[PDB]
Structures are given as structure tokens and as C-alpha cells.
């Protein structure tokens, strides 16, 4: 999913300074228990920007040959402030090279935003509305292509595409289409905002989003949430949850989980496993903060190994331990989180099965998963679904939904099996 490259960058400090900011240190950890020094910002027309090599999110390994390993924040700052005007940096980059490789919806190769916008306008305005054409277009374009369509639509009609579709569509189909027209962060932010109703908060939707999104996704959600609603996501969580459930949700929503490490820390894997047992099944009652700290701070690959080592000590695996130890929203949040850590595509496959298996449909959950995972890991979700349930995700959608709504969801599924 990611690539790591190292590189020596040589900067000359000009009248505007080096032109970048840093975070980190043993006392100001960027992510949980990470003491590294990271570039947080790069100023324009500064030395780093005009050089081009340094990038935000870079880890700074050394300055003028001095290693930035396990330093106080101030000691790293002092090494920069006491450097000369010729500054040599060894830096580590982190590059994401996955994209939509495991998504079911790909960018349409022969895309033409103006053509799509015109054909959707025509479909909206034909007598009776041509929902088939609207579904065929919008579910067979990537999210960013949909944004270009919406821009071209507004330019030619002087009306917003989402407003026009609110009038042209109804029912679950409208929910699907309007969801697809939001960016991933806008969609997640709006779903979280809608779930927070004070004492009527939709904990299940809160849990699903907060427990399953990564650091990078949550950082974008936090930024977009603030722009859209003029309040920080964390503040709305605090005012709409309570108890240990609130502390868990707040911790997860920060999106500061330890990032994937190069070295597997076997000693910490074992110690975390013992701690989880000692805090839960081994004792009367539960030390919930210890569970929260471990499960929100460690990297996902680390915790995967922790949960297996936990079985060496405990007669019960982590999931059945949660069921035995806690109840209510807190129990449901831990259960979702542990499933997300162990196998995220299987987590979504099981949530999709649950949304359809019984009487009627939990359309809110079904739609949200099909919209939000279609460009992420729907191909992996489909593989886990077929392996566990024998029939395909496509088949269950077909049995539980009908009409143009069904057709849109099957396009988001992408194919059978």
C-alpha cells in the first residue's frame, strides 16, 4: 500500500529561513508512541519549497549528521536553530501507490465531463425522468469524475446538480445518488453529523465510520467536518456521547494511531497481549482505559499479532473476551474495532450480510458501505463475502432490493462473485 524511500536533501538557509515546520519528539509524539521528527508544513517561496525535495509528512532522520532519534522536541528544535546556513538533511518519504486497485468502481477511460453533464440534464428533463441513464453514468465514473460532471452541470444550467437530482429522484435511489456526489470526506463527515442527535445519537453509524477509517482518512474527515459545520468533529462527539464509549470514540477520531513500522516489535506484542488479558479476563471487572490505550495507539499490523498472542494467555479470543467483559455501546464499539483491525474487508462483508439477512433491509448501512467502499476495497469485500456466505454480494443485493435502486447498488458492487 505504501513505499518508503530515503534521500539526502541539502538546503541553504535564506532570508526567509528554511521554510518548513516540524512536529514530534519523545514528549510531543506525532502519532502514538512515535518519537520521530516529521515535517508538518512547507512554506511557499521558502528554502525547502524552492528546492522541491522535502515533502510534508516526511520523517527527518538526521540534521548535519546528527541523528534525530528519541530526542525531546526542544533538542531537535535546537539542532535546527543552531545549524549554520548550509543544512544537510537525511529524510524518509512515505508514498501511497495503491489508489483504487481494490475498488470496484474505476475511473472511466473515455470520460467527457461536458458530455456527461448534458446527458444527465436531458435524462432529468425527459418526461418522467430517465433514471436508467442517470444511474448508468454516475455509478460508472470515479468520485472525482463525478465532481467534474457536477461542475460542468452547474456551469451550463446555472443550477446545482444535487439540487436538480433531489427533485428528479426519490426513495433509496436518491440516497445512493446524492451520496455518490459527495467527496469521500464530505460523505463521511455528513454521515457522522447526521448520526449525532444528542441522546438520540446513532451509535452504530458512529462506530462504523470512526472504527474503520484510517489516520489519513480521519484527518481529511476532521478538516472537512470543520469547514462544513463550523465545529470540530471531536467537540460534537464529546457533546453527544458519554462514559468509556466517549473516551474510545474521541481517541479513535483523533486519527493518530501509530503508523506501520519497518521492524516488528515482538517484545511489545507480547507485553500488549499480557496487558489485555490482565486488564480483562484475568481480573474481576475490567480496566477499560488500558484496553482503549492499546487498541487505539498501536499499528494495525502490530495489533493483529497482539490478538493472536493474546490467545496464548487467555482461554478466550479477543472478541469473546469483549463479550464477556463489557456491554452496551462500549461492547459494540470494541467488537467493531477488533474486527476492523483483524480483517477490514471481512468486517464490511459481515455488516453487509447483517444489513440484508433478515426481514427487510438496513438500507442506511447497505448504501453507506456500497458508496464509501466502492473505490477502496470492494473487490476484497466481495471475495471475503463469497468465501464466507457461499453466494455473492451481488446475489444478496439482488434478493433484497429492487428497481433502479437495485441497479445502482449492483453497479457499485461491480460484478457477480
Amino acid at each position: 500500500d505504501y513505499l518508503v524511500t530515503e534521500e539526502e536533501i541539502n538546503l541553504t538557509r535564506g532570508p526567509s529561513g528554511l521554510g518548513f515546520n516540524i512536529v514530534g519528539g519523545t514528549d510531543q509524539q506525532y502519532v502514538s508512541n512515535d518519537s520521530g521528527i516529521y515535517v508538518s508544513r512547507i512554506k511557499e517561496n521558502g528554502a525547502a519549497a524552492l528546492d522541491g525535495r522535502l515533502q510534508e509528512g516526511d520523517k527527518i532522520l538526521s540534521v548535519n549528521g546528527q541523528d534525530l532519534k528519541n530526542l525531546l522536541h526542544q533538542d531537535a528544535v535546537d539542532l535546527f536553530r543552531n545549524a549554520g546556513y548550509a543544512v544537510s538533511l537525511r529524510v524518509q518519504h512515505r508514498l501511497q501507490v495503491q489508489g483504487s486497485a481494490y475498488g470496484s468502481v474505476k475511473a472511466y477511460t473515455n470520460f467527457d465531463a461536458e458530455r456527461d453533464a448534458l446527458n444527465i440534464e436531458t435524462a432529468i428533463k425527459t418526461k418522467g425522468v430517465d433514471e436508467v441513464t442517470i444511474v448508468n453514468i454516475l455509478t460508472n465514473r470515479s468520485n472525482e469524475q463525478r465532481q467534474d460532471i457536477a461542475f460542468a452541470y452547474q456551469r451550463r444550467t446555472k443550477k446545482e446538480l444535487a439540487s436538480a437530482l433531489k427533485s428528479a429522484l426519490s426513495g433509496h435511489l436518491e440516497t445512493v445518488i446524492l451520496g455518490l456526489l459527495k467527496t469521500p470526506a464530505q460523505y463521511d463527515a455528513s454521515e457522522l453529523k447526521a448520526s449525532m442527535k444528542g441522546l438520540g445519537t446513532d451509535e452504530d453509524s458512529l462506530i462504523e465510520i470512526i472504527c474503520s477509517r484510517t489516520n489519513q482518512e480521519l484527518q481529511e474527515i476532521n478538516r472537512v467536518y470543520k469547514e462544513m459545520y463550523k465545529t470540530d468533529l471531536e467537540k460534537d462527539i464529546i457533546s453527544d456521547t458519554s462514559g468509556d464509549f466517549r473516551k474510545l470514540m474521541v481517541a479513535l477520531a483523533k486519527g493518530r494511531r501509530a503508523e506501520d513500522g519497518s521492524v516488528i516489535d515482538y517484545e511489545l506484542i507480547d507485553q500488549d497481549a499480557r496487558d489485555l488479558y490482565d486488564a480483562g479476563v484475568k481480573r474481576k471487572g475490567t480496566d477499560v482505559p488500558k484496553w482503549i490505550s492499546i487498541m487505539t495507539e498501536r499499528s494495525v499490523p502490530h495489533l493483529q499479532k497482539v490478538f493472536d498472542r493474546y490467545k496464548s494467555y487467555s482461554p478466550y479470543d479477543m472478541l469473546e473476551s469483549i463479550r464477556k467483559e463489557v456491554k452496551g455501546d462500549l461492547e459494540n464499539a470494541f467488537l467493531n474495532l477488533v474486527q476492523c483491525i483483524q480483517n477490514k474487508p471481512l468486517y464490511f462483508a459481515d455488516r453487509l450480510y447483517d444489513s440484508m439477512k433478515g426481514k427487510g433491509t438496513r438500507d442506511k448501512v447497505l448504501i453507506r458501505i456500497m458508496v464509501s467502499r466502492s473505490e477502496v476495497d470492494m473487490l476484497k469485500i466481495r471475495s471475503e463475502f463469497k468465501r464466507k456466505y457461499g453466494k455473492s454480494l451481488y446475489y444478496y443485493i439482488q434478493q433484497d432490493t429492487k428497481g433502479d435502486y437495485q441497479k445502482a447498488l449492483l453497479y457499485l458492487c461491480g460484478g457477480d462473485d
Partner: peptide, 5 residues
């Protein structure tokens, strides 16, 4: 707390 350099 970020530090400008």
C-alpha cells in the same frame, strides 16, 4: 505545537 524553522 509545530515549530517554524
Amino acid at each position: 505545537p509545530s515549530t517554524t524553522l
